[PDB]
Amino acid sequence: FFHASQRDALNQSLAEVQGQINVSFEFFPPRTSEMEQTLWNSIDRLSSLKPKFVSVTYGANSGERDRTHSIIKGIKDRTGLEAAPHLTCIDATPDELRTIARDYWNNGIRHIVALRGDLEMYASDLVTLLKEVADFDISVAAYPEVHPEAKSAQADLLNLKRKVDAGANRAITQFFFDVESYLRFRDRCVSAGIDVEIIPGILPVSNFKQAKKFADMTNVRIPAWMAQMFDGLDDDAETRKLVGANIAMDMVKILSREGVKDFHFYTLNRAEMSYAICHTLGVRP
Amino acid sequence: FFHASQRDALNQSLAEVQGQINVSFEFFPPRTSEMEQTLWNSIDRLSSLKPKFVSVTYGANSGERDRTHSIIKGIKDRTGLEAAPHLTCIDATPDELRTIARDYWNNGIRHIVALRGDLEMYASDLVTLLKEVADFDISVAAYPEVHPEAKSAQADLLNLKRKVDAGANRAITQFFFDVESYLRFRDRCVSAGIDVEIIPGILPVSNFKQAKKFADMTNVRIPAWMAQMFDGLDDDAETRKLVGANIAMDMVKILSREGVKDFHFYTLNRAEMSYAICHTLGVRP
Amino acid sequence: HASQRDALNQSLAEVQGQINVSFEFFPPRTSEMEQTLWNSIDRLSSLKPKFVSVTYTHSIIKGIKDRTGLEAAPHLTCIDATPDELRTIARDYWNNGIRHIVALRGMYASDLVTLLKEVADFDISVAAYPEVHPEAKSAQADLLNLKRKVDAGANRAITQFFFDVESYLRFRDRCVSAGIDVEIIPGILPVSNFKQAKKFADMTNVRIPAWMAQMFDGLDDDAETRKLVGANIAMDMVKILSREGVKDFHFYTLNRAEMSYAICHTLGVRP
Amino acid sequence: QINVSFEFFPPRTSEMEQTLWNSIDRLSSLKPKFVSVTYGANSGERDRTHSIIKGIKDRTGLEAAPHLTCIDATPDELRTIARDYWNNGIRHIVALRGDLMYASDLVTLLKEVADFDISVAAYPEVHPEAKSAQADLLNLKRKVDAGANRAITQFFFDVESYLRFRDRCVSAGIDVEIIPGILPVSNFKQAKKFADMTNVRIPAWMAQMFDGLDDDAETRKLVGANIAMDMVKILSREGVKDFHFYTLNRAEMSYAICHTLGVRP
Ligand SMILES: Cc1cc2nc3c(=O)[nH]c(=O)nc-3n(C[C@H](O)[C@H](O)[C@H](O)COP(=O)(O)OP(=O)(O)OC[C@H]3O[C@@H](n4cnc5c(N)ncnc54)[C@H](O)[C@@H]3O)c2cc1C
Ligand SMILES: Cc1cc2nc3c(=O)[nH]c(=O)nc-3n(C[C@H](O)[C@H](O)[C@H](O)COP(=O)(O)OP(=O)(O)OC[C@H]3O[C@@H](n4cnc5c(N)ncnc54)[C@H](O)[C@@H]3O)c2cc1C
Ligand SMILES: Cc1cc2nc3c(=O)[nH]c(=O)nc-3n(C[C@H](O)[C@H](O)[C@H](O)COP(=O)(O)OP(=O)(O)OC[C@H]3O[C@@H](n4cnc5c(N)ncnc54)[C@H](O)[C@@H]3O)c2cc1C
Ligand SMILES: Cc1cc2nc3c(=O)[nH]c(=O)nc-3n(C[C@H](O)[C@H](O)[C@H](O)COP(=O)(O)OP(=O)(O)OC[C@H]3O[C@@H](n4cnc5c(N)ncnc54)[C@H](O)[C@@H]3O)c2cc1C
Ligand SMILES: NC(=O)C1=CN([C@@H]2O[C@H](COP(=O)(O)OP(=O)(O)OC[C@H]3O[C@@H](n4cnc5c(N)ncnc54)[C@H](O)[C@@H]3O)[C@@H](O)[C@H]2O)C=CC1
Ligand SMILES: NC(=O)C1=CN([C@@H]2O[C@H](COP(=O)(O)OP(=O)(O)OC[C@H]3O[C@@H](n4cnc5c(N)ncnc54)[C@H](O)[C@@H]3O)[C@@H](O)[C@H]2O)C=CC1
Ligand SMILES: NC(=O)C1=CN([C@@H]2O[C@H](COP(=O)(O)OP(=O)(O)OC[C@H]3O[C@@H](n4cnc5c(N)ncnc54)[C@H](O)[C@@H]3O)[C@@H](O)[C@H]2O)C=CC1
Ligand SMILES: NC(=O)C1=CN([C@@H]2O[C@H](COP(=O)(O)OP(=O)(O)OC[C@H]3O[C@@H](n4cnc5c(N)ncnc54)[C@H](O)[C@@H]3O)[C@@H](O)[C@H]2O)C=CC1
To answer: How far apart are CA A284 and CA C145, in angstroms?
Structure first.
């Protein structure tokens, strides 16, 4: 009865949203010939979905800044899509950052994901610095379950407001598996007067061990039912993929029904899962 | 809020049912060396799930009866699992059927899926004939959306009652995608005084074109959202598999919450999807 | 509540093209009603119903068959007729292309079914009463009679109109567990005139739910609102019935096509 | 227990003028809490809106609220107009911006003139020009904080959309009533045009329901009344006790819908 009809309604609603969802994909700089090939294969397949934009990460304190910039250029040259480099300020001086920013702008890179990076400058300072350089589109990190270093949930929330007030035109969340946490956070952002959309960062899980490691380092809660779902699958990649896709598809269906029309996917350079999740959202070639 | 909490509750409930679900798998006689290999690979993998039983189909009017019996023997000899041959009465005389039945019993085959088969004997007649031969475990076909040849839903329902009264100890449904139809049918079976469990026959869909063909021939309704879900995937087998697994997993989660503790899977000789669906039900090696 | 409504409406939209409908008419008593009736026939015919029937007549049936070609099934009662004449009329119909006959009493219906059977292989349709026929001594008794009529050869059963959906559903559940293997086709009475409808009800022992009485309260002089409210009630009823598996509907048009036509439209039954 | 309001538009032809007054007489018997009259910048102007408001008041004694926008109007002009309306007994105004001062600026301006009862527009499916859903919700809060006494929503056909929106409003601390604007549909072509211009979602089952009825007004009316009655029934079950009807100057449908809600003469 209830559970059945609820499913049908949720499913039909999702079907009718086709054509109204905006998506973006996050990639990281390949470290090997194999990953390089995989990445470009993924870029080609996901580019057909016409994402609002794609972004490329940059490991803070890595000194591999050139890799990020190189990938960004290649993406623009091959797809004509807007590619946003992630830029951290914890490992660079204001002068270096202004130089880096000016170069991006002159190279046609007009969207930057401004982050602080892990341990004189916090992300909000980078946002201001970037806005002084040029009228950049700026995306910043949001934490539904609170950044692990925040003094309080209130402080972390106020910090997001600070970043938006400084010029950030959108917020992208750390991944989460507790859907209610995201929804509650979205309401709190309204209460704090934040007027930008809080874009959910979605992590499709095929490798649970890896996800649990990411999660444990970021204070993200993995529900008991999810841990039980992946238990016993250490050596079953096929079942992990099916189970993970089911989880992600369930997640975006509920989010879509709650009015979310923008999704950012942590692809980890693989396209299969994100491509299928987008398919269910009506985002097709 | 609502949709979110409902998901969490459904998911947690499913997690807690681990160890209480009975499953069975249906296979068909391979027609080529390739399918033969695939089938035994699937048998080996699904056998580790300890199914209550497995069954092997027999195409009515095919004259390939020996193929079914051969596969059944091989399964018993290799796994030690109960293997139930499907037996049709539309293409054999009572004498031939009694002979066939006696041979099965003497060969250790004590469970038969008694069916009529497509066009002097209806399935109910076969049930009676089988019970006279020996004390067989007998499974019969049930149709939540009504068999296409029934004079009415009432007649088809009364026919199921006839089969049970004649000796059938369980009913297995034709596949369905409208979960409410199964639930309503289960309630009607109670109203008709049928005291056996109505086991849902689950069809995990990876090939939509094939499923639609099966469905159109059997009066099974494919919801509009499901047709839209597979639209545009004719040449994308990977996405079809992920989408189909999501549908099947959603289906058994809702069924499980409604008290269903028995599931029969139409594997079409492939194990991957059914194996993963069983994993979500807590049915693991 | 909201989601369930969305699910019900969608499932209804998908049943489009699989529901069978039939329309019941009555012989006109005036030139005006003659005009109205045939206009309805032309209108409702475009919906290609499984069949249409005329209360008891033979002429109207012929005209319908000659004008639309639809299976016109005339009603037949046991009153004012002898078994001899019955067989005569029965054979008179079958010999005129009339294959479907709604056997009614008005010497019971069962005997009428048996008689038509012993004459030819007609498609017999009898009456069913979800709220028990007023004359019947008991619910079970009237129930067994229906079975007797079905056993006698009644192909399908058509219920007296009703407004309490649960009553029809409970009755259908008792019909199956009673061994009746025919579909209990719900007879739908779209209400535009509450006074007239309440009259029929009090004459057939049909219950008018309190909510229905309240819904029509104060509309004696508001035909417009009555029609919208009645169409709504009939709409909701067939929607719920459809979700319960009912794929056959019989409409008591009272020779008017507007409402029945609209209700069919929502069931996917369109030209 | 349930309060209703009706919205009308200034007639532009003699035929529509007759229709409107017939509808006013019919609907006034239901004693609505108030009725409102829309404004068409290039389709009637403020004088026509005002004329109808005055006529309704004189003929029925009902509270009539003009829809007042601030496009191509100066603050001084708006103050002069509001003062005149107040002095003439018009004490409820539906304050709007109008398509391209924001509505919140008008609310403030009006409250400075007098203690007007003020209603503002709300969008369950977000105003088309809003930066985001969050920004549109914060704007509604700004309008309420500026003095708006209630919010009236753009029409919708996805009931859950309205329910989820109402919940977000409450979470945001918006304490006034979020009154659903109901559009009974008898002309689907016209409704779809309205919807396509305002980001309002039309469920698949609904589009399907009106398919093939382009030249069948009778069936459209019966089908649309069913949809509307179904909608208000669910909304009522969910705690809604105020409905605003987009009559499009016709009374039959809204009258019947109110009847089912127990709102009768
Ligand atoms: C969408 C997304 C993409 C990412 N991509 C990358 C990437 O490519 N490379 C990489 O290195 N990292 C990346 N990260 C990780 C990120 O850099 C870390 O989470 C980092 O520790 C914080 O960065 P931030 O931009 O959130 O910092 P901030 O917004 O500055 O927040 C960090 C902490 O400082 C606190 N804070 C802010 N201002 C003050 C103040 N004045 N005093 C005290 N505390 C204060 C905050 O509450 C918080 O606890 C990403 C995160 C997200 C969610
Ligand atoms: C779990 C499952 C497994 C199957 N496996 C196979 C297989 O291996 N091989 C194969 O050939 N087919 C198979 N089928 C398909 C099946 O044989 C067809 O659906 C067939 O047309 C009916 O078989 P049945 O056993 O349901 O027949 P029955 O139960 O006899 O029903 C068939 C029809 O006859 C009607 N009926 C019954 N008694 C009477 C009566 N006395 N008078 C009039 N009508 C009556 C019923 O209402 C129904 O419409 C399977 C179906 C299911 C659901
Ligand atoms: C679809 C429909 C169409 C109709 N069309 C017409 C029409 O065209 N013309 C017309 O004149 N009337 C018509 N009627 C009304 C009908 O004729 C009356 O309801 C009438 O009272 C007889 O009903 P019946 O045909 O069910 O007879 P029956 O089926 O014989 O049942 C009537 C009563 O007799 C009782 N009963 C049956 N057998 C016995 C027995 N052996 N001993 C004692 N009690 C017994 C039953 O329980 C019941 O109370 C229609 C009704 C319906 C529902
Ligand atoms: C009940 C109802 C009745 C209506 N009646 C009429 C009528 O009679 N005549 C007519 O012409 N129109 C009418 N409208 C249509 C309305 O005028 C349009 O929707 C118009 O485009 C916006 O009006 P508003 O009052 O909602 O403006 P606002 O509430 O000002 O909203 C308009 C947009 O501006 C945004 N916004 C608000 N403040 C700011 C800011 N400071 N910076 C940036 N963006 C901001 C909002 O989020 C929104 O996208 C009606 C609408 C409703 C729902
Ligand atoms: N939340 C996010 O989107 C990201 C967070 N980070 C954080 O910064 C640290 C340093 O980055 P790297 O030098 O690349 O470390 P790394 O080399 O371990 O990570 C490689 C890549 O994996 C992906 N990844 C890693 N952690 C992730 C996370 N928590 N969420 C989503 N994607 C993730 C990113 O694409 C990252 O570039 C990471 O260990 C992580 O803590 C880094 C990139 C993205
Ligand atoms: N419902 C069921 O479980 C089955 C139904 N059937 C019906 O009997 C007919 C004849 O059988 P075959 O000679 O094998 O035809 P076939 O050669 O086309 O089918 C081969 C196999 O595919 C699977 N299959 C086909 N239709 C199916 C269905 N509707 N549901 C679940 N599995 C299905 C069965 O394992 C079947 O043995 C089929 O076309 C079908 O209509 C046959 C087997 C199973
Ligand atoms: N339930 C039914 O389908 C029918 C019931 N009857 C009833 O049997 C008696 C004799 O019939 P008439 O001389 O035609 O009476 P009548 O002259 O009052 O009725 C004329 C026609 O209106 C329709 N009608 C009348 N009552 C109805 C009802 N309760 N339900 C559905 N349709 C109805 C029928 O088409 C009937 O032929 C009357 O009491 C009449 O109401 C007659 C025909 C059909
Ligand atoms: N949401 C509302 O209640 C209203 C919205 N508007 C919108 O403002 C803009 C300018 O208006 P006009 O030039 O008069 O357009 P128009 O000339 O197409 O509209 C004429 C009249 O029809 C009614 N109407 C039109 N759109 C409606 C809607 N979406 N919802 C309810 N009633 C509606 C109103 O009474 C309006 O005065 C248009 O986009 C129009 O849709 C105008 C009046 C009311």
So the answer is: 60
